[PDB]
Structure formats: C-alpha cells, structure tokens
Amino acid sequence: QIAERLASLRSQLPPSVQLIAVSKNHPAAAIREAYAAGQRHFGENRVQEAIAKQAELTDLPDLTWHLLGKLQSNKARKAVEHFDWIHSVDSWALAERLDRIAGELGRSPKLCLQVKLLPDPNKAGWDPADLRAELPQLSQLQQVQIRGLMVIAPLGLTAAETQALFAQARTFAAELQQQAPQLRLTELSMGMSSDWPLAVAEGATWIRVGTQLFGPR
Numbered sequence: 001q002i003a004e005r006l007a008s009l010r011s012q013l014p015p016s017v018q019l020i021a022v023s024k025n026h027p028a029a030a031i032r033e034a035y036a037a038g039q040r041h042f043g044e045n046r047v048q049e050a051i052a053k054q055a056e057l058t059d060l061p062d063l064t065w066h067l068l069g070k071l072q073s074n075k076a077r078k079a080v081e082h083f084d085w086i087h088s089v090d091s092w093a094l095a096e097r098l099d100r101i102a103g104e105l106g107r108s109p110k111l112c113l114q115v116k117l118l119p120d121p122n123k124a125g126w127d128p129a130d131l132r133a134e135l136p137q138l139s140q141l142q143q144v145q146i147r148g149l150m151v152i153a154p155l156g157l158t159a160a161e162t163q164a165l166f167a168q169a170r171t172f173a174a175e176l177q178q179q180a181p182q183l184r185l186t187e188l189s190m191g192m193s194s195d196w197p198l199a200v201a202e203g204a205t206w207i208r209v210g211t212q213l214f215g216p217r
C-alpha cells in the first residue's frame, strides 16, 4: 500500500510542491518499495541511520537525501558527505562549520534554516531576531546553498494555530529575502502527516511526510 498512498498524496499536490518521504524508523525495504513507485526524495533524522540505509540501497542510483533532525558538530562532516539537503540548520556556528567542511570536501549542501516562530520545548530553532542579525554573514557563505526556511509545528496546535504559523513562516521568509537579495530563499519546508494540506495552502514547497506513507514504526 506504499504505492497507493504515494499516488493518492501526489495526485493532491500542485507542481510547486515536492514531497519528502520521511523514512526515519522504517527499514531499507520500505524505501525500496517507495522508489518502485517513483519516489526519489527521502528524509532521515539521524546521520548514522541514513549512512547504514545508504549502504543497503546501492541498487538505487538517483536518491536525494534530506537531513531533518538536530545536527551536532560531531556529525557535521558525515552530514555534508551523505546528505544533499540539511533542513535543520538552527545556528550561525553550525552554518559556518558546514560551509567550511563543504569547502574542504568539494560539496555544496542545500540548507534550510530551521526557525522557531512559537514556543516549542521539543525542538530547537533560530530566534527570528537572531536570524535577522546574522543574515549578512549567512549571505557571504560560498560553499553552501541557503534555499529556505524550515518550520515545525509545536505539538498539539489546533488547525487554526497551525495555519497561522505556516502563513507567518511564509511572510517571514519574504521579509528575509528582501533583506538579503544575494540569497535564493525560494523554499519553505513545512507540513508533515497531520498538517501538510495546511502547509501547502500557505506556500510550502517541500512537505515532509512519514506516517501517512509508511504507516507506524
């Protein structure tokens, strides 16, 4: 039924939205089945779990891997080696480090900046004013491609609160784009299994769906 859930979900998305199939807590065989249904973008929250899966998927030539979880400095080199996108960039120090590493490795990861717009004790994220302050410095990084913002809803929001959070993410990104015209801030990484339709309606370009596609762990 992975193939059926994928087709059902894709039929609903406009061309502007790409789906990331979030395979965290599912094995390589799940990913293989999604791929046979035409899925190419997969998301993981742990670097080592993705490294292991990648070693079991040598049959898949054209995967794009997205890192969705908190990235500490001790996994930064592996992150840059093994992921195409890193959505969870939540600080200047991390951004600067990824940029130096990417230089040394000859890679150019595509990054989203993970921004905290509402209180959430479960997730890290940039303070909006801290992010406005660092934009000149982020603008000058040469070895990463900063492409957008990532926003994750605090647990237990209502539909209406979620809808307003995603709208706020859209408007904040536009404000940053105006303040940093060097940045190609074209993306909004938002929406998961329960709220992706709200995210799409407010301008998401990447949605991140796990459970609705793969079922539970």
Ligand SMILES: *Cc1c(COP(=O)(O)O)cnc(C)c1O
Pocket (backbone or CB within 6 Å): 022, 024, 045, 068, 069, 152, 192, 193, 194, 208, 209, 210, 211, 212
């Ligand atoms: C777990 C997770 C997802 C997928 O969540 P579902 O509710 O299973 O769709 C997407 N993005 C991030 C950052 C996650 O941690």
